[PDB]
């Protein structure tokens with residue numbers, strides 16, 4: 168996360184860290200939607216251009232974390248995966264359209280002060296909150312900058328980062344990139360004339376774009392960090408997978424594999 | 427700084443799972459009866475040039491020697507040896523050995539297997555090939571610094587036979603030197619002369635040697651290559667290097683981006699990367715997936731494995747993180763060679779009739795190699811950076827854990843160097 | 854009531870947790886607000 172700040176403890180209890188099992192390394196973000204299902208970006212698991220094509224056995228998820236690298240004994244929960252499910256219409260060749268995937272935990276996880284699921288939006292909530300100007304929140308342990316600092320690096324945070332960003336009008340998103348945008352993705356970020364900044368960066372993919380409902384005061388995951396063109400650049404915006412538009416797929420996968 | 431970078435002990439963590447106790451293991455029954463013979467035939471020779479076939483076998487010997495040598499140091503020690511130097515020294519020394527003493531050497535060094543490979547191959551071919559190889563590696567400059575000394579030193583009271591003196595010189599561009607180990611002035615003049623000949627690279631060649639030594643092998647090598655794709659210096663930053671499942675240490679980490687060959691080996695559970703040096707030589711970096719997987723990697727390394735890795739690699743743009751380091755070792759290979767089966771040679775009763783008419787006892791085979799690895803290299807390799815960027819972690823080959831490295835001369839398939847970096851902060 | 858959450862999945866395949874989703878133990882449950890959620894509420898200030 169670029170231009171964000173340290174999250175507070177338990178601020179994003181549905182935050183999941185996707186980990187390579189062996190060798191051990193942070194791969195992406197993800198989110199907890201129940202005691203056995205995790206949601207993430209499809210390209211975090213399958214992306215040929217980078218020779219990525221993981222299976223259930225190559226991964227691990229770390230739930231309930233705050234610190235990026237410390238093993239948080241009796242607070243975080245480490246789980247293996249039973250199965251991975253990528254959207255059948257996921258398009259990694261052109262625009263990462265339908266960049267979404269589900270991962271089923273090998274064993275249900277217990278909830279606690281640090282582990283709790285986020286809600287998935289219903290049609291009305293999505294229709295009311297997904298509008299230009301409304302702000303959402305993005306969290307992650309990805310890099311703090313796009314550019315390299317001589318003899319230091321791009322910068323990694325010690326704890327979970329968070330940043331609030333406004334949803335942007337389709338026309339402006341469309342005019343900001345030569346990439347072909349679809350109805351299954353939306354973009355967020357500040358306009359150059361707005362002064363404030365912030366964005367997701369390398370390593371934040373898969374993490375959730377959430378909004379707190381003013382109708383029932385519950386947190387909803389409206390999007391999944393997907394892609395961009397450089398982090399925090401003026402006139403550019405981050406793109407997120409439109410979760411509600413793919414809710415039917417999520418429901419299908421869970422219905423025939425959940426039990 | 428105020429943060430811990432913890433390795434996760436998965437077995438320990440998951441052993442606390444509730445269903446751990448419900449595991450159903452296998453009983454070791456009365457009897458079974460089964461097996462599968464061996465025979466590590468060398469069908470690796472097909473299409474291989476004459477010099478490559480000899481180097482494939484020299485490599486086979488090198489890995490066996492490494493296997494023995496590593497069990498004589500700590501698992502946390504770095505290791506560095508120059509296999510080609512060891513093999514040529516034994517080839518050279520065998521010029522004056524006879525009988526079984528000679529046979530053990532040719533057998534264990536795998537020279538016997540080479541002569542057997544083809545009908546047109548004879549012991550003379552070995553010496554001829556070493557003569558050619560030696561010239562190419564040390565008597566020519568291809569773009570890297572490779573300084574070396576590989577001679578015999580025989581106490582003056584034991585005159586060296588003429589035929590040996592001249593053969594060593596002709597086939598190995600080396601010398602069987604007269605020496606006086608009990609004379610400090612000899613040590614000084616000699617160390618000094620070697621320094622001048624090696625332009626200051628190889629120093630203290632004959633230091634700390636028993637004054638009663640009758641004969642010893644001196645093999646010192648200095649190496650420093652230049653990267654084809656150099657590591658830009660602004661990318662060099664401190665990075666955590668994982669020593670083991672519990673400790674980490676900050677080291678200078680070099681970083682770059684370019685098209686490099688690499689592969690993921692599922693059989694030996696490791697990642698392999700190839701880095702090109704100017705002059706037709708390359709460094710092969712092998713990092714096991716699990717830190718506890720180093721012992722099995724070392725245990726199964728063979729020429730066949732290396733060829734399998736080489737064919738399986740693919741070229742792709744990737745970021746590379748390699749710690750800079752400098753290894754300087756000084757071993758006495760006698761004990762190791764004995765364990766491999768070469769014993770008569772190191773016993774006074776061994777037959778070295780070809781070297782001297784007197785009985786000589788060899789107790790020291792000094793093998794001292796030095797290698798420096800830093801960001802120096804020719805240059806560039808475009809500093810691209812564009813648009814479309816999926817936001818997951820990118821493809822990088824990160825050498826931040828104990829690794830092995832093999833340095834090969836491409837044209838001859840010669841294993842120049844082999845090492846293990848368990849800790850880049852030490853030498 | 855419209856302020857009450859309505860479940861959409863079947864706990865038999867979804868697992869437990871939907872009914873109480875989106876309510877943080879260390880925040881909503883304790884009647885505490887995080888340091889920047891207010892900024893989100895203020896942006897929803899209509900459309």
Ligand SMILES: *[C@H]1O[C@H](CO)[C@@H](O[C@@H]2O[C@H](CO)[C@@H](O)[C@H](O)[C@H]2NC(C)=O)[C@H](O)[C@H]1NC(C)=O
Pocket residue numbers: 215220222
């Ligand atoms: C890696 O992903 C799959 C493996 O998950 C690779 O191949 C397919 O694997 C599945 C089993 O998981 C089989 O059902 C298919 O038949 C396999 N395809 C075949 C026969 O080639 C796949 O090749 C790799 N990457 C891609 C492109 O998905």
Ligand SMILES: *[C@@H]1O[C@H](CO)[C@@H](O)[C@H](O)[C@H]1NC(C)=O
Pocket residue numbers: 541542543544545
């Ligand atoms: C060794 O090789 C030669 C041919 O080069 C052959 O005559 C001899 O039988 C071989 N010995 C064996 C069986 O290894």
Ligand SMILES: *[C@H]1O[C@H](CO)[C@@H](O)[C@H](O)[C@H]1NC(C)=O
Pocket residue numbers: 685686687740741742
């Ligand atoms: C791919 O291209 C690079 C750039 O020249 C080269 O160094 C590398 O060896 C190539 N890989 C293959 C297939 O040899």
Ligand code: NA
Pocket residue numbers: 355356357358366399400401402403404405
């Ligand atoms: Na922006």
